[PDB]
Amino acid sequence: KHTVRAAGAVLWRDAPATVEVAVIHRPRYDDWSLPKGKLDQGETEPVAAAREIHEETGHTAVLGRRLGRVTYPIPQGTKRVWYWAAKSTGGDFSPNDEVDKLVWLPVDAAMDQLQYPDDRKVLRRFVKRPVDTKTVLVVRHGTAGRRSRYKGDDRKRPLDKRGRAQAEALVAQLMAFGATTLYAADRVRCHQTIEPLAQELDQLIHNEPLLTEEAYAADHKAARKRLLEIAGRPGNPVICTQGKVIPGLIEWWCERAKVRPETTGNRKGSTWVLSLSDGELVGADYLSPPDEK
Ligand SMILES: Nc1ncnc2c1ncn2[C@@H]1O[C@H](COP(=O)(O)OP(=O)(O)OP(=O)(O)O)[C@@H](O)[C@H]1O
Ligand SMILES: Nc1ncnc2c1ncn2[C@@H]1O[C@H](COP(=O)(O)OP(=O)(O)OP(=O)(O)O)[C@@H](O)[C@H]1O
Numbered sequence: 001k002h003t004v005r006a007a008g009a010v011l012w013r014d015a016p017a018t019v020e021v022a023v024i025h026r027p028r029y030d031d032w033s034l035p036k037g038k039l040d041q042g043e044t045e046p047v048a049a050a051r052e053i054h055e056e057t058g059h060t061a062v063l064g065r066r067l068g069r070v071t072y073p074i075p076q077g078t079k080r081v082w083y084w085a086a087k088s089t090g091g092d093f094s095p096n097d098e099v100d101k102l103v104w105l106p107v108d109a110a111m112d113q114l115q116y117p118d119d120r121k122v123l124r125r126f127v128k129r130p131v132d133t134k135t136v137l138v139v140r141h142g143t144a145g146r147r148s149r150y151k152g153d154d155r156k157r158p159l160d161k162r163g164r165a166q167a168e169a170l171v172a173q174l175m176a177f178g179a180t181t182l183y184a185a186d187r188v189r190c191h192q193t194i195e196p197l198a199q200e201l202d203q204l205i206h207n208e209p210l211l212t213e214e215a216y217a218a219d220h221k222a223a224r225k226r227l228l229e230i231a232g233r234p235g236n237p238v239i240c241t242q243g244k245v246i247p248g249l250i251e252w253w254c255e256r257a258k259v260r261p262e263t264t265g266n267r268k269g270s271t272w273v274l275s276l277s278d279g280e281l282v283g284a285d286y287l288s289p290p291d292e293k
């Protein structure tokens with residue numbers, strides 16, 4: 001009944017399924033499995049997955065597509081593990097008492113090495129779609145108090161204390177996907193959400209008047225074409241906008257690409273990870289706000 005939250009990865013490298021994936025052995029359990037671990041206080045699942053990859057395998061990585069959820073019973077209640085595809089960006093494994101072996105295997109061989117049926121289902125998802133993906137990160141701005149009850153939008157209303165903390169927490173989450181470039185709708189609260197990331201990257205935030213609530217309602221087509229324009233540029237863009245805009249854009253793109261999101265939501269501080277392969281949408285993964293389950 002109590003849930004223990006964890007995250008892990010299919011860590012891959014170049015040798016389509018030409019790639020090799022990492023499978024680890026743990027002496028405590030005598031098991032062969034995918035790297036994973038429990039979320040620390042304040043972490044979200046992507047942050048934990050990236051950290052655990054580095055701690056268990058020695059590799060840095062960039063997360064891509066989400067690969068589903070595993071649950072199993074434990075004395076504490078239920079363990080829940082979300083998985084990501086993760087491209088290695090280098091490193092070296094050193095055997096130790098917690099993880100004593102790491103093998104790099106083609107997917108078919110890794111399938112045989114993995115002992116847990118639900119790890120094998122994660123690996124089957126991994127191979128269903130391309131893995132060398134670029135990433136568009138669509139973020140609903142953080143909490144920013146409430147609009148006045150007179151009909152309309154407020155341009156300058158800032159994040160509240162909670163929302164500032166969400167913005168700070170988003171840095172590690174968005175970095176986990178290799179965010180490179182920053183865009184925000186023409187509202188203060190949208191810029192403030194990604195300001196911490198902007199400081200981390202030392203990047204400017206490109207202002208997007210076409211992506212506000214009012215602009216989307218006046219001209220949804222221009223908003224859609226702007227999203228595609230941004231997505232088409234080199235790098236992995238973060239686009240921070242508003243609640244009336246995101247569901248429509250995501251639904252539209254998923255529908256025309258025939259992509260099924262495994263989770264849905266639209267909470268302030270949430271992120272949609274849109275995975276692209278040669279311009280085609282291949283994944284749409286809704287991440288909860290950093291301070292919500
Ligand atoms: N995918 C799985 N399906 C079913 N049982 C599993 C799975 N992974 C591990 N187990 C079992 O559950 C028990 C706890 O293993 P688990 O990997 O959750 O422990 P842990 O030490 O808390 O690891 P972690 O730090 O990776 O979260 C072990 O006996 C293990 O064999
Ligand atoms: N005065 C208002 N006029 C029009 N819509 C409103 C008004 N107040 C609330 N809403 C609706 O409620 C939603 C949430 O409003 P709230 O004031 O909680 O947050 P918000 O910071 O404005 O959110 P967002 O920028 O994502 O729209 C809005 O997206 C809008 O749909």
Ligand SMILES: [Mg+2]
Binds near residue numbers: 035036037038052
């Ligand atoms: Mg572990």
